[PDB]
Design a binder for this molecule. Structure first.
Ligand SMILES: NS(=O)(=O)c1ccc(NC(=O)NS(=O)(=O)c2ccc(Cl)cc2)cn1
Ligand SMILES: [Zn+2]
Length: 256
């Protein structure tokens, strides 16, 4: 599977039949149809003790990985019951500034989307959590092209060292608080992983406020490769799944 003509999102269902399931992600967020749920709590993002370890090009995106063997960087509150530990973040992005995000807002596509992936500590580890309907919480943040995001630059500058699939680099002391927007207002709905295995284990929390990144920053994302070293160059771009049917779901808003 991948994002090409012959192995892209429209093909995934053949190996991953859940691709046509009842709670697939991403979705379009119709802002007028989302309903304010006054009982939704403010989100608690507690990243002060985060321990980043490594950055990896996995052939479909790059993951910044964290130590999730203790409650160091956690997400709580909002729609969530209990404590969700940060395991990794990654992005999805386009070949052009007018596409790249997975979620859309009133059909608007952003240039990219950041996913901070967390797992519910009552399930003990990530592999068990993905087998549960409330196993994961993914915090989604839109990126638009404008001013640079200073907190992103340390990521941008290491990408040369992980150009190709399977490459990793040490990536300690990275503070993911530098990727957050000012407001934590969000939409939330039950969904899935957006890449195979497409498991229906995610509480999605998608922030309303995008972060701005510069054209130079996103250009560096687009220099990455899907291929391994010594293989024909295929630029890592358009690694996003399009919006999937909402089916029997309501998107809730934390704000009016
Ligand atoms: N929804 S998402 O944030 O883009 C997202 C999609 C897919 C994944 N997939 C993922 O972690 N795959 S994996 O590491 O190979 C893996 C690991 C363990 C299991 Cl049990 C299943 C899959 C993570 N986040
Ligand atoms: Zn993702």
């Amino acid at each position: 599977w991948g994002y090409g003509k012959h192995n892209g999102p429209e093909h995934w269902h053949k190996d991953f039949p859940i691709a046509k399931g009842e709670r697939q992600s991403p979705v379009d967020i119709d802002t007028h149809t989302a309903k304010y749920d006054p009982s939704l709590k403010p989100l608690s993002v507690s990243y002060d003790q985060a321990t980043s370890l490594r950055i990896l090009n996995n052939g479909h995106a790059f993951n910044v990985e964290f130590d999730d063997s203790q409650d160091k960087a956690v997400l709580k509150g909002g729609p969530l019951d209990g404590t969700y530990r940060l395991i990794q973040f990654h992005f999805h992005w386009g070949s052009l500034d007018g596409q790249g995000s997975e979620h859309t807002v009133d059909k608007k596509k952003y240039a990219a989307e950041l996913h901070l992936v967390h797992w519910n500590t009552k399930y003990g580890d990530f592999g068990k959590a993905v087998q549960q309907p409330d196993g994961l919480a993914v915090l989604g943040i839109f990126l638009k092209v404008g001013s640079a995001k200073p907190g992103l630059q340390k990521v941008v500058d290491v990408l040369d060292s992980i150009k190709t699939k399977g490459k990793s680099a040490d990536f300690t002391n990275f503070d993911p608080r530098g990727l957050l927007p000012e407001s934590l207002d969000y939409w939330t709905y039950p969904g899935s992983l957006t890449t195979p295995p497409l498991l229906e284990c995610v509480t999605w929390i998608v922030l309303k406020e995008p972060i701005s990144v510069s054209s130079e920053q996103v250009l560096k994302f687009r220099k990455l490769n899907f291929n391994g070293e010594g293989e024909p160059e295929e630029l890592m771009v358009d690694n996003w799944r399009p919006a999937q049917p909402l089916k029997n779901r309501q998107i809730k808003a934390s704000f009016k």
